[PDB]
Curated annotation (Swiss-Prot):
Function: Component of the origin recognition complex (ORC) that binds origins of replication. It has a role in both chromosomal replication and mating type transcriptional silencing. Binds to the ARS consensus sequence (ACS) of origins of replication.
Subcellular location: Nucleus
Note: Present with 3930 molecules/cell in log phase SD medium.
Binding partners and assembly: Component of the origin recognition complex (ORC) composed of at least ORC1, ORC2, ORC3, ORC4, ORC5 and ORC6. Interacts with MCM10 and TAH11.
Domains: entry comment: The N-terminus is dedicated to mating-type repression.
Superkingdom, natural source: Eukaryota
Native species: Saccharomyces cerevisiae (strain ATCC 204508 / S288c)
Residue sites binding ATP per the record: E74
Protein family per UniProt: Belongs to the ORC1 family.
Binding-site list for Mg(2+): D73, E74
Protein name in the entry: Origin recognition complex subunit 1
Signal peptide: none
Length: 105
DNA sequence: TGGTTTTTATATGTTTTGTTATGTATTGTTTATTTTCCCTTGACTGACTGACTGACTGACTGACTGACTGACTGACTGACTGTATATA
């Protein structure tokens, strides 16, 4: 919230929050779905959305792509099988042409 | 140009088959001890059969025996030949 007021400084580059309550989500691949349906409002399945999103991330340069900040909540039950989801996530977090602000709990 | 059909991706459901860990019961492993009848050890027992004692009848040398055969010698009978006798 203090960082929101810092966005209300209008001297830092505007960026956007993402609430992630996987516990207020059913199927833990819906992260990608809701991500696309809130960054675009466009509706797909995870196996299109995350892939279009990698396409959105590394294949896309900086000058128009936006900083986004995201924070994950209670990962102890989210990734219970093999953490391929969160593996994908942390695999997205390793670029130099893409910019993001990631956190978890 | 413009409407319609065909296939595909995502999502879920259905069914069969095969994988892993485990707790309980049976049975094996090692060691010590006693009994059983089969297999060695051996004298007794019963028929056996080798050397010694009897024996029994066919083979070669003792020639034998005795008839018969082989040379010699005289006896005898036939063939040869003289003495003799008779007639022209």
């Amino acid at each position: 919230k203090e960082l929101l007021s810092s966005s209300a400084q209008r001297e830092i580059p505007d960026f956007l929050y993402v609430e992630i309550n996987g516990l207020k989500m059913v199927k833990p691949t819906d992260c990608y779905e809701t991500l696309w349906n809130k960054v675009s409002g466009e509706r797909l399945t995870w196996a299109a959305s995350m892939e279009s999103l990698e396409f959105y991330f590394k294949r896309v340069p900086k000058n128009k792509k936006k900083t986004i900040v995201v924070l994950l909540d209670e990962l102890d039950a989210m990734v219970t099988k093999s953490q391929d989801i969160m593996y994908n996530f942390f695999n997205w977090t390793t670029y130099e042409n893409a910019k993001l602000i990631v956190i978890a709990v």
